[model samples]
Target: SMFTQRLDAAAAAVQAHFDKVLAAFEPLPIVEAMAHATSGGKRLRGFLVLETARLHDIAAGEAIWSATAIEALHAYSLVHDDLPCMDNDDMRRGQPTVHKKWDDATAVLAGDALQTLAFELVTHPGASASAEVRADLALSLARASGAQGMVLGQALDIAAETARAPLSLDEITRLQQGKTGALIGWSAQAGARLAQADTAALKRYAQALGLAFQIADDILDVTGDSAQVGKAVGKDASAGKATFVSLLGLDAARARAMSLIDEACDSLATYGAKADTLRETARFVVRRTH
Candidate 1:
């Protein structure tokens, strides 16, 4: 898969940079927790950032830094999401969650610190971009990651889970758009902006891709396996969650995901060859089992 191949390379690159950063801190519990927390994943976000940069012919140096920053942000979110007050997940990516691996206080602090590390890495003078550009990327990522965007979405998700509200398809879509869609949209946008792209078509394409990706996620949660998915299947149903699959049934959810994927691909028609990576990434989102 393009994402896998790209993420493998991106993961190596990100790990190399992260290792250098890790060396600076005294090897303590917090530092060890940070290292352990980021140790897994296919690095899909990093792949998108680097692939977008490469597709746009941006310098490799800048892409590496952006890739690292984005992955850190994603990792930070996962750490927090797995907390008892949130998803309360015991396992993630086939291993113990941060809260399970360490004390709750340590896990919470680790998540908070990891978020700060994301911006710090992006804005570091050593990255191969102008301070202004780095600042812009940092600010963009922060906005999407915070209360007005992804975090708000998470808050809403938790509320929905507990309330167990019988949300309609439209409401479900809105929630997904905020929760899962925002960071995805921001990832595409940040990569595009870092590579000097801002066409109206590109913006539309990104939004479509984000929607498609989240719809795909909804389908997989129902049909996918625990082992392949790296989490318990039917958790949505068990939690009385208002997912697309729960509202529309599995077959209908799959169909909707395909429709969204088609729309996503069509939105990028204006970009010619330059949008191939983004195009593939959209397809990958649906096809992936995990």
Candidate 2:
């Protein structure tokens, strides 16, 4: 319940921050589309940014910059992912996707600019007193969102679609580490990175959490109502796509997620009671309805 309250509060702050950051832009169709893409979500990524900042005693003002950056990049990814060339979805967060609301060209440009804004926000002088820290954040983001991470995961997924063989548990785990886990991992590490502290523990928490996040997604895909899920369901099973649920069976997959929550919570021991919110987050990710 506290996680929900905190998460909701973070979402409000970040959404307002996004509007403020983009207010200076010309009211072009591209800009509107960018706003549309960024609108409405649990804002879990931004919450991680802010919570971790709190963990390290960093100011919310500085943390909000990177929070906006992470959310922007995530919006860009969704815009591109929903393109006719990709998932071909028409909706996200209960509205027409960017490509559907605007032309394909407009959607493409919006995604491109939102991605650019991510870097710009992170690199803002107000985000950090030290340029070196900003540079680290920017560089790490590029790597996570680029060919080596999320893109790699996307590529692997696409390949698996056509491959003669299905992805194994190990293979899917690797794919998820890049595609889904990379940004999540980066978000968890961001606070420590800003504090210029060692990120080893947060990194461990994030990796396990990310995998469990994906496994929960698979479980939801199988068991979730299409309306509540906000995405089509049963398609993966019918398509024979390799997923945690399909590979490990539903019960086993649920068990795996619980195990991961344990691992993620264990990594927070160093922070003691201060990290309770993050521990709640580990539990939240696996039990989400959407």
Candidate 3:
């Protein structure tokens, strides 16, 4: 539960940051939509940012900006992904999706605003003392969430809708590396970048954890109900779309997830017991009901 404690703490911190920034901005629906989009969820990515920052001895006050920023980006991504043109979902975080609660235009623009806000928050004067550090964070975040990263992953998914076949285990691995893993990779590196410390270990850990993360989501889709998952279940499976479970079957896929977590923990040996919370976090991904 130590991991859960820290995760909840990060969630509270980032949520407050969201309210502080958005409670005072934009036209009527825009700010409301931003607030709507940013509220609720596991806050897993934001927690990763804070944990990595803790690993480097970075203070929460300085790191919370990046923590909140990644959550903003995540909210933006989810808003767009829930559009009728995409998942067309009517639910998120056990509530209505932005498109469902509002409209297509609002969803699009709200998502756009949050994406820009992600940039603003991450590059704010208080986020880092060095212009170079802020710029590096912004640059990496752009590449991580833009055409070469998250966007490319979305493109691949859309592309697959017309492809000759469902993606193989090998193909889907690369697909998710960009889709779900991109922001995770960036969040994992926030502290290292902030401290000008070497990022190899966290990079390696995120890689392994990200894949396991995706796999865990796949397992949840098979095992969880709509309300439990806070969204639809086994969606890609119903569409003949590829997933870790589809590529490897349920048992094998779960085994693979566990194995990857072990690998992820091994990659963090440099941090020894200090990394245990991240260890439980990786396990939490697979063990969680949602």
Best by lDDT: 2
Q: After superposing candidate 1, which stretches have Cα over 4 Å from the reference? A: 1-4
Counted clashes in each candidate structure: 0, 0, 0
Model 2: lowest-lDDT 10 consecutive positions: 230-239
lDDT of 2 by residue, 1-290 (tens): 78789999999999999889778899999999998999888888999999999999999999999999999998999999889998888877878888888889999999999999999999999888989999999999999999999889989889888889888889989889998999999899999999999999999999989999999888888998877876677878776799999899998999999999999999999999999999999999999998
Clashes of 3: 0
Whole-structure CA lDDT of model 2: 0.91
Off by over 4 Å in 3: none
Model 1 clash tally? 0
Off by over 4 Å in 2: none
RMSD of 3: 1.0
- lDDT-wise, the better of 1 and 2 is 2
Please list all clashing residue pairs in model 2, or write none if there are none.
none
